[PDB]
Swiss-Prot record, chain B:
This is Small ribosomal subunit protein uS9m. Component of the mitochondrial ribosome small subunit (28S) which comprises a 12S rRNA and about 30 distinct proteins. The lineage of its organism: Eukaryota, Metazoa, Chordata, Craniata, Vertebrata. Disulfide bonds: none annotated. Belongs to the universal ribosomal protein uS9 family. Coiled coil: none annotated. Signal peptide: none annotated. It is found in: Mitochondrion.
UniProtKB/Swiss-Prot annotation, chain C:
The modification N6-acetyllysine is found at K101. Keywords: Acetylation, Mitochondrion, Ribonucleoprotein, Ribosomal protein. The chain holds residues 2 to 137 of 177 of the full protein. This is Small ribosomal subunit protein mS23. GO terms for molecular function: structural constituent of ribosome. GO terms for biological process: mitochondrial translation. Component of the mitochondrial ribosome small subunit (28S) which comprises a 12S rRNA and about 30 distinct proteins.
Curated annotation (Swiss-Prot), chain D:
This is Small ribosomal subunit protein mS25. Its main location: mitochondrion. Keywords: Mitochondrion, Ribonucleoprotein, Ribosomal protein. It comes from Mus musculus. The gene is Mrps25. GO terms for biological process: mitochondrial translation. The lineage of its organism: Eukaryota, Metazoa, Chordata, Craniata, Vertebrata.
UniProtKB/Swiss-Prot annotation, chain E:
One of its GO terms (biological process) is mitochondrial translation. Belongs to the universal ribosomal protein uS2 family. Component of the mitochondrial ribosome small subunit (28S) which comprises a 12S rRNA and about 30 distinct proteins. It comes from Mus musculus (Mouse). Required for mitoribosome formation and stability, and mitochondrial translation. It is found in: Mitochondrion. Keywords: Mitochondrion, Ribonucleoprotein, Ribosomal protein. GO terms for molecular function: structural constituent of ribosome. Signal peptide: none annotated. The gene is Mrps2. It comes from the Eukaryota. This is Small ribosomal subunit protein uS2m. GO terms for cellular component: mitochondrial inner membrane; mitochondrial small ribosomal subunit; mitochondrion. The keyword Amino-acid biosynthesis does not apply. Its main location: mitochondrion.
Length: 100, 42, 136, 56, 223, 216
């Protein structure tokens, strides 16, 4: 049986390195009006806006391309002993993935 | 009832059904005025 | 009658004590189970305190030896134009193939980091991978 | 709380625990010790703990 | 007669894994569900550092070896409670998983409270529910924080009533009052979906095991 | 709860400002409860009528029952010294027949707890709530001999002067008995109280010390 230490070393998330300015593939699982909730394989989902071009194509289950920025949006503010998290990730939707 | 400890088992049992219906319709995918001259119950 | 003092002892210790006193006449149904299969730690209240002066936490930064190679690849070529797929448990990115070949050459015995970096680029070029040395 | 370090040294029971009663010949006992070092630790502890018992 | 009742209730406690909950999960299964992913280092609670494998570029990683040990104990305890016909209440305030947790409780045969928690629900239950209301015998906290990033009120109130709690605790959570903490990810849908499946299979096995144990011992009395 | 007895410790009658009568009346009552067998608790009850404050405090305290460990059912397991806010308490374990030589409020609570022989001194502020909270805080955090045997793995042995050199085993480790002797320093670093030590140094006590008093 593979050990947890081995799994972590060979994990796709461990290979990604820093998540800033990386390219990843996501899947839309929830849509609210023109806001798309996209799971890209991390702990937290991201939320992007439906692009003007080919808007109808972005439906649930559609795989897309993203440019990660942060895996979790968090920031400490004055008089806070812990970071304030919004339980969301930051990414820029680039467009649909070619099925090919 | 499985929602007894909520304190409003009947209100939340109804909100459970309508939220599950909404999810199946959104996952699965005309004029909505099937009924006219009607109001929501008070 | 009970012990609603959740800052002294634990649910089990307070239940053990109440029965010894004589206030709780019937064991709870979860009591015997806790006695036979207790948790690893006793659930006792503790007030979180802050660290002061030179006290620090003890958390190891996770850095494998491949990261030295991966850092160079991202600085020299950036992220591979192919998009990461983090849903495939066995996905091999362009960078991870670079690190697999870089390791193979290092096993042969090459000791110069510069030699291993340019030779790996040539090998992947033969494989057909499109590596762009983007300084931008 | 009694002041100082090891306040038990300032109790009559501790002072009476000393067992070194010098012969009548002994008149002076000079103690030369160093405050810093590693080989003089026992000497420093002797001044701290034992000199009161000897004087008592 | 008396021996049969003693056999049903006393025999299960003589085996380390009477319900064989070990097979339900594995470290690999937990790793597939992203149960090792924690909040950023800034959000870390001091009482969670024992369970954290390390910090992978700002993201705390949760040791999945401790999770397997702790999860084994928590699932075993949840099974013996379900075996003895105790009331189990699932509690969470995460609204993404509100419907999933209510569906799980209904499938198990237990109870869920995913809505706003009224002050005094457990410490003043007689006024709210009735004179002879039976409180839960176990509370499973799939989430131990409320939506203002503070401990769910039922964590402290369940300790006041001497109710054991099986809770999923993440890197920003406070496990001190959780009787059986399960260190792991609580935000990812794949992590929560795995835990809900484990708790539901475990509860159903224990309930089925009780039925079979009763029939065998009951049949012996005539036979 | 016929086995439990309730005792009052403080009763404050204070007038407060509210639009009903301009100045409204309020009674704050601190009580203690105990069965005399180790289980005891305290609570504060407030009302406009004294009777209502008595009922509220009495039934609230039955929900906050500490269990206090008594050595051989008559005394605390060891000396206890603590400061709760500005109220310092210093309790001492005593032999049988010593009685309760303590602040009148500590005598009241000790009877509810079941402690029969102890000494205590209270200094600083005499606030009744801080003394009650501080008392239960120390009595409920004390270490029984069995706990000490388990923590260190060694036997806990007792030596009474009325039994001579006879060693009495009061607690044996539940698991594995260790073989490393507990380190014995030549001179302990204990922090001593001048009040305790002053007596053994031969210093005259006050005229008020150790006076003849009725059986407590
Ligand atoms: Mg979380």
């Amino acid at each position: 049986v593979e050990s947890f230490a081995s799994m972590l070393r060979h994990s796709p998330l461990t290979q990604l390195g820093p998540a800033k300015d990386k390219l990843v593939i996501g899947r839309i699982f929830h849509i609210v009006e023109d806001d798309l909730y996209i799971d890209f394989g991390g702990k937290f989902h991201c939320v992007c806006k439906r692009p003007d071009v080919d808007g109808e194509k972005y439906q649930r289950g559609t795989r897309v391309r993203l440019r990660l920025l942060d895996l979790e949006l968090t920031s400490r503010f004055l008089g806070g002993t812990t970071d304030t998290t919004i339980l969301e990730a930051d990414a820029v939707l680039l467009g649909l993935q070619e099925i090919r | 009832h499985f929602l007894f400890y909520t304190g409003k088992q009947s209100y939340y049992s109804l909100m459970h059904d309508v939220y599950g219906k909404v999810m199946q319709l959104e996952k699965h995918r005309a004029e909505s005025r099937d009924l006219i001259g009607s109001r929501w119950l008070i | 009658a009970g012990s609603r003092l959740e800052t002294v002892g634990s649910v089990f210790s307070r239940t053990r004590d109440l029965m010894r006193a004589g206030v709780l006449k019937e064991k709870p149904l979860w009591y015997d189970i806790y006695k036979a299969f207790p948790p690893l730690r006793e659930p006792v209240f503790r007030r979180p305190r802050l660290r002061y002066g030179k006290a620090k936490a003890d958390i190891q930064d996770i850095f494998y030896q491949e990261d030295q190679i991966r850092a160079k690849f991202f600085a020299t070529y950036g992220s591979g134009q192919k998009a990461f797929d983090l849903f495939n448990p066995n996905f091999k990115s362009t960078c991870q193939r670079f690190v697999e070949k870089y390791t193979e050459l290092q096993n042969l015995g090459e000791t110069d980091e510069e030699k291993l970096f340019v030779e790996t680029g040539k090998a992947l070029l033969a494989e057909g991978i499109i590596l762009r040395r983007v300084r931008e | 709380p009694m002041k100082g370090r090891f306040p038990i040294r300032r109790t009559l029971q501790y002072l009476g625990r000393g067992d070194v009663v010098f012969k009548e010949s002994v008149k002076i006992m000079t103690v030369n010790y160093n405050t810093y070092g590693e080989l003089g630790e026992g000497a420093r502890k002797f001044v701290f703990f034992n000199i009161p018992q000897i004087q008592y | 007669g008396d021996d049969f009742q003693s056999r049903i209730l006393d025999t299960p406690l003589q085996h380390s894994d009477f319900f064989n909950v070990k097979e339900l999960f594995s470290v690999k299964s937990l790793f597939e569900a992203r149960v090792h992913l924690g909040h950023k280092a800034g959000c870390r609670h001091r009482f969670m550092e024992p369970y954290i494998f390390g910090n992978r570029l700002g993201q705390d990683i949760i040791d999945l070896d401790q999770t397997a040990l702790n999860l084994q104990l928590a699932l075993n305890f949840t099974a013996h409670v379900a075996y003895r016909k105790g009331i189990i209440l699932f509690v969470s305030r995460n609204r993404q998983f509100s419907h999933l947790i209510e569906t799980t409780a209904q499938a198990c045969g237990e109870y869920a409270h995913t809505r706003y928690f009224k002050g005094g629900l457990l410490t003043n239950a007689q006024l709210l529910f009735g004179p002879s209301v039976r409180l839960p015998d176990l509370i499973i906290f799939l989430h131990t924080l409320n939506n203002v990033f503070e401990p769910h009120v039922a964590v402290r109130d369940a300790a006041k009533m001497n109710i054991p709690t099986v809770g999923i605790v993440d890197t920003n959570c406070n496990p001190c009052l959780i009787t059986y903490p399960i260190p792991g990810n609580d935000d990812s849908p794949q992590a929560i979906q795995l835990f809900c499946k484990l708790f539901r299979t475990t509860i159903n096995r224990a309930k089925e095991k009780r039925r079979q144990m009763e029939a065998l011992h009951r049949l012996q009395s005539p036979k | 709860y016929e086995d439990f007895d309730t005792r009052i410790l403080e009763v404050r009658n204070v007038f407060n400002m509210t639009a009903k009568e301009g100045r409204k009346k309020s009674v704050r009552v601190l009580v203690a409860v105990g069965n005399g067998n180790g289980a005891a608790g305290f609570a504060i009850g407030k009302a406009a009528d004294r009777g209502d404050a008595f009922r509220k405090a009495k039934n609230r305290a039955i929900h906050y029952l500490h269990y206090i460990e008594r050595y051989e059912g008559h005394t605390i397991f060891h000396d206890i010294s603590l400061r709760f806010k500005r109220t310092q308490i210093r309790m001492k374990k005593q032999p049988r027949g010593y009685g309760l030589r303590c602040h009148r409020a500590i005598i009241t609570i000790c009877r509810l707890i079941g402690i029969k022989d102890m000494y205590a001194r209270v200094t600083g502020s005499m606030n009744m709530l801080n003394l009650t909270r501080g008392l239960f805080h120390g009595l409920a955090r004390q270490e029984t001999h069995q706990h000490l045997a388990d923590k260190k793995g060694l036997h806990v042995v007792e030596f009474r002067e009325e039994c001579g050199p006879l060693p009495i085993v009061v607690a044996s480790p539940h698991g594995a008995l260790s073989k490393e002797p507990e380190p014995e320093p030549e001179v302990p670093d204990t922090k001593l109280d001048w009040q305790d030590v002053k007596a053994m140094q031969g210093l005259k006590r006050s005229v008020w010390f150790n006076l003849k008093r009725p059986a407590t």
